[PDB]
Design a protein around this ligand. Structure first.
Ligand code: 1M0
Length: 146
């Protein structure tokens, strides 16, 4: 398909350079990393402070570069606990200039959370990156709450 070829081209030109997460109330930085957690086909791991589970909302800064132009870059993301999706989020970035580097800010709302001790190692966040309806990649991060 021209569409599958196009998906592979966008993925080939894409890199997530760095990402931060903040308490949306505090503005305090809770986690940061420079590892591209969006790379597909390998299970990524992340160690995050357990106090993040007590935030009402978390603010994400995601810096990415893309050789390919995209009309409607967006994400759909799910939290899975032992295999079961507990919640889903949708975020839209929109147009991406070819060969651009971009910082995307998002406010992620928590929608009752189990304790960190129960969740740790048993949560996966699965993120699907799309351009409009074309699925570009699917990646997964297993979470440890410390
Ligand atoms: C305000 C709710 C707290 C938090 C919210 O969720 C997210 C926080 C960051 C992301 C996220 N955006 C990404 C973009 C590209 C690639 C991966 C991305 N992720 C997953 C991620 C990002 C950074 C570190 C670890 C995992 C996705 C969801 N959350 C977290 C959580 C805490 C810290 C970091 C990530 C998730 N674990 C939860 C378990 C049950 C319910 C909600 C949970």
């Amino acid at each position: 398909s021209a569409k599958d070829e196009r998906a592979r081209e966008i993925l080939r030109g894409f890199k997530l350079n760095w990402m931060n997460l903040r308490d949306a109330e505090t503005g305090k930085i809770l986690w940061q990393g420079t590892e591209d957690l969006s790379v597909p086909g390998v299970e990524h791991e992340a160690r995050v402070p357990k106090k993040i589970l007590k935030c009402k909302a978390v603010s994400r800064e995601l810096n990415f570069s893309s050789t390919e132009q995209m009309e409607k870059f967006r994400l759909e993301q799910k939290v899975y606990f032992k295999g079961q999706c507990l919640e889903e989020w949708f975020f839209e970035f929109g147009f991406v200039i070819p060969n651009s580097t971009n910082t995307w800010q998002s406010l992620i709302e928590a929608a009752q959370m189990m304790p960190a001790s129960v969740l740790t190692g048993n949560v996966i966040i699965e993120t699907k990156f799309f351009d409009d309806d074309l699925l570009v990649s699917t990646s997964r991060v297993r979470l440890f709450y410390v």
